Amino acid sequence: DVTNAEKLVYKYTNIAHSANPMYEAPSITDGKIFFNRKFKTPSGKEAACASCHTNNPANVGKNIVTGKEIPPLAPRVNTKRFTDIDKVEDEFTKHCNDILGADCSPSEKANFIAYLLTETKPTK
Numbered sequence: 001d002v003t004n005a006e007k008l009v010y011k012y013t014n015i016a017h018s019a020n021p022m023y024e025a026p027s028i029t030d031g032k033i034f035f036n037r038k039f040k041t042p043s044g045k046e047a048a049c050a051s052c053h054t055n056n057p058a059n060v061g062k063n064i065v066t067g068k069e070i071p072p073l074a075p076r077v078n079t080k081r082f083t084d085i086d087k088v089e090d091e092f093t094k095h096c097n098d099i100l101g102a103d104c105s106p107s108e109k110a111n112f113i114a115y116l117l118t119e120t121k122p123t124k
């Protein structure tokens with residue numbers, strides 16, 4: 001595990017750098033607000049990455065669609081996550097297109113992947 005996680009980082013980082021020579025590496029201090037910033041959707045409705053994945057992804061989320069239960073999202077915390085890359089290399093763009101209404105920035109992904117592959121301490 002991680003092999004992919006690390007790849008993504010080294011991936012989304014390259015792409016970004018390929019777009020903005022300024023961006024070279026990610027951080028673990030940006031993957032918070034962006035995931036805790038009550039943003040508005042193009043479908044007239046506010047939401048947040050912490051609306052389902054809670055303020056903390058490593059924690060137990062909850063879908064506001066069915067209201068079942070979304071176990072820890074932390075793809076790193078869980079050994080049964082972030083396995084495939086091909087697929088994952090889309091489900092992330094399709095998501096932002098169904099969350100924000102478009103494809104998230106390449107520098108916003110490597111960021112999340114970082115914080116996701118960084119924080120591994122849940123509350124309870």
Ligand code: HEC
Pocket residue numbers: 035047048049050051052053063064065070071075082088091092095096099100112
């Ligand atoms: C509820 C309406 C959600 C909000 C708000 C956001 N996401 Fe989400 N996410 C949601 C679901 C139903 C799923 C599928 C898995 C599950 O059990 O819920 C996901 C999955 C992700 C993933 C993993 C993708 C994969 O590895 O296949 C990521 C990385 C992810 N979500 C990130 C993410 C971000 C960045 C969000 C704000 C821009 C966000 N989610 C909001 C449901 C919901």
